[PDB]
């Protein structure tokens, strides 16, 4: 299938409570494989998946040094963002960054990412061309000028087309047992009378990986998008995910409703009904 690697940075200032906390989590698809936390007793990059543990001592050194240098980088960014937005030193603020690469089944780069947000708003993002930037405002335009001058897009591109895809390739081989296994959802429909003449049909999907799934209800073969209560896909804690979709239907009309399920672990989409 297709695969993605992402690193997620969060840097949070906390005036009066020490220097800003820096955290990094790395993911291949929906699997956490690495973490760093500046608040850890001895901060370093830590393995979070068995297939990453085979990486040698030098890997962990190199990765740890990156995160430690990043801790300082992002604390400066926070101070700089304060100046660019004319903000007081009394408030708590957050910078986030997500970056990485998507690859296709053949292991080739589909696209790269490198996006920053400040206080949850877009700040600066590398364009898909991997050559130019989008600055959200006049503050981010200052960073843009800076990064254009220092040819930062050229360096990101070099990473994204090289080491990003190369390491992802290697992680996928090392974790092929899990990363390259899709677990289809276990699916059932439940029936709950709300009242005399209304019942809830809840279509359940459990035990699936990766997280991407589509669960929809139809009535006489027509999408019930507006009448469907759809919960957010949620982790079970055993690597897998769960989701449900519910529709309220008139008593006796249950058989007019079908649940439809799409997931990459399924050869064909599934159609489900309440089974009295």
């Amino acid at each position: 299938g297709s695969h993605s690697m992402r690193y997620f940075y969060t840097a949070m200032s906390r005036p009066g409570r020490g220097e800003p906390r820096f955290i990094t989590v790395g993911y291949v698809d929906d699997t956490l494989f690495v973490r760093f936390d500046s608040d850890a007793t001895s901060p370093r990059k830590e393995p979070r998946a068995p297939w990453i543990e085979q990486e040698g001592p030098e890997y962990w050194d190199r990765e740890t040094q990156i995160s430690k240098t990043n801790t300082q980088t992002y604390r400066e960014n926070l101070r700089t963002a304060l100046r660019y937005y004319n903000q007081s030193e009394a408030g708590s603020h957050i910078i986030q960054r997500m970056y990485g690469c998507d690859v296709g089944p053949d292991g080739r780069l589909l696209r790269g990412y490198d996006q920053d947000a400040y206080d949850g708003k877009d700040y600066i993002a590398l364009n898909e061309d991997l050559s130019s930037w989008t600055a959200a405002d006049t503050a981010a335009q200052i960073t843009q000028r800076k990064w254009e001058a220092a040819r930062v897009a050229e360096q990101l591109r070099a990473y994204l087309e090289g080491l990003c895809v190369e390491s992802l390739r290697r992680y996928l081989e090392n974790g092929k047992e899990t990363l390259q296994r899709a677990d289809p959802p276990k699916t059932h429909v439940t029936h709950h009378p709300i009242s005399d003449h209304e019942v809830t049909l809840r279509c359940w999907a459990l035990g699936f990986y990766p997280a991407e799934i589509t669960l929809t209800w139809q009535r006489d073969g027509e999408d019930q998008t507006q009448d469907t209560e759809l919960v957010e896909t949620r982790p079970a804690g055993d690597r897998t995910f769960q989701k449900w979709a519910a529709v309220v239907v008139p008593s006796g009309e249950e058989q007019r409703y079908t649940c439809h399920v799409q997931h990459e672990g399924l050869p064909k989409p599934l159609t489900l009904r309440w089974e009295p």
Partner: peptide, 9 residues
Amino acid sequence: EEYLQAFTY
């Protein structure tokens, strides 16, 4: 694997 983006805002 990460890379070092050394350049600040």
